């Protein structure tokens, strides 16, 4: 690893600075270095990892989207395809790096539901990003589905319906159903059941937990509004 020279704690500290500076590539490299130290991640540290790579891959997806749309209009010189391929190859590289970190060795060492569901959701997310770009695509979709399903089974056994990780997992799994798996009815059914079960569990939450959970439930409702 490139960050083998820096203390674990200094990598985490600099990751938070990079976030403040909105330098998400630096942030990702710092958190990649922290992971490669070999110790498990705290809840805070896991979210720093996710925030960093989600911003990096997010800019890549947005760019791939623009170029792919330009490419498809020109099909209704080689430059548009070439550069779209470059961004695409770059996006796949970031996804493979994240999946590499999860496979070596964050997932196998994650024993608590909070950490294991988080990493398996993340694994589903980044196979979903690869899927958005693939054509191979069937196998990537199955890998995404498998990771999401494993995470769902654990969250249903081990987490209350208003747990933000469980809600975010269900939200993203329903996006997978709707956008990737051509299962819009499965997407709608999962969003409804997720929303309703969380609603019934809100009475157990504190003021702050209530805010955290309802914020994510609103995304479920927004999608249902767009989907129906």
């Amino acid at each position: 690893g490139a960050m083998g020279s820096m203390e674990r704690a200094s990598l985490i500290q600099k990751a938070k600075l990079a976030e403040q500076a909105e330098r998400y590539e630096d942030m990702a490299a710092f958190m990649k270095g922290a992971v490669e130290k070999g110790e498990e991640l705290s809840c805070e540290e896991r979210n720093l990892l996710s925030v960093a790579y989600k911003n990096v891959v997010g800019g890549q997806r947005a760019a791939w989207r623009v170029l792919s749309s330009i490419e498809q209009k020109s099909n209704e010189g080689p430059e548009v395809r070439e550069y779209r391929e470059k961004v695409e190859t770059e996006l796949q590289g970031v996804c493979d790096t994240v999946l590499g970190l999860l496979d070596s060795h964050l997932i196998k060492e994650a024993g608590d539901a909070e950490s294991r569901v988080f990493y398996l959701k993340m694994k589903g997310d980044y196979y979903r990003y690869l899927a958005e770009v693939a054509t191979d695509k069937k196998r990537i979709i199955d890998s995404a589905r498998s990771a999401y399903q494993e995470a769902m089974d654990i969250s249903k056994k081990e987490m209350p319906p208003t747990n933000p990780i469980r809600l975010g997992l269900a939200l993203n799994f329903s996006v997978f159903h709707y956008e990737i798996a051509n299962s819009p009815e499965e997407a709608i059914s999962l969003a409804k059941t997720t929303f309703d079960e969380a609603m019934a569990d809100l009475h157990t939450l504190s003021e702050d937990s209530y805010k955290d959970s309802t914020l994510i439930m609103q995304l479920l409702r927004d999608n249902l509004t767009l989907w129906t």
Binding site: N47, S50, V51, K54, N55, L167, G168, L169, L171, N172, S174, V175, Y178, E179, A187, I216, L219, D222, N223, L226, W227
Partner: peptide
């Protein structure tokens, strides 16, 4: 496009 879990 469908809305994802936010950070």
């Amino acid at each position: 496009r469908s809305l994802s879990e936010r950070l």
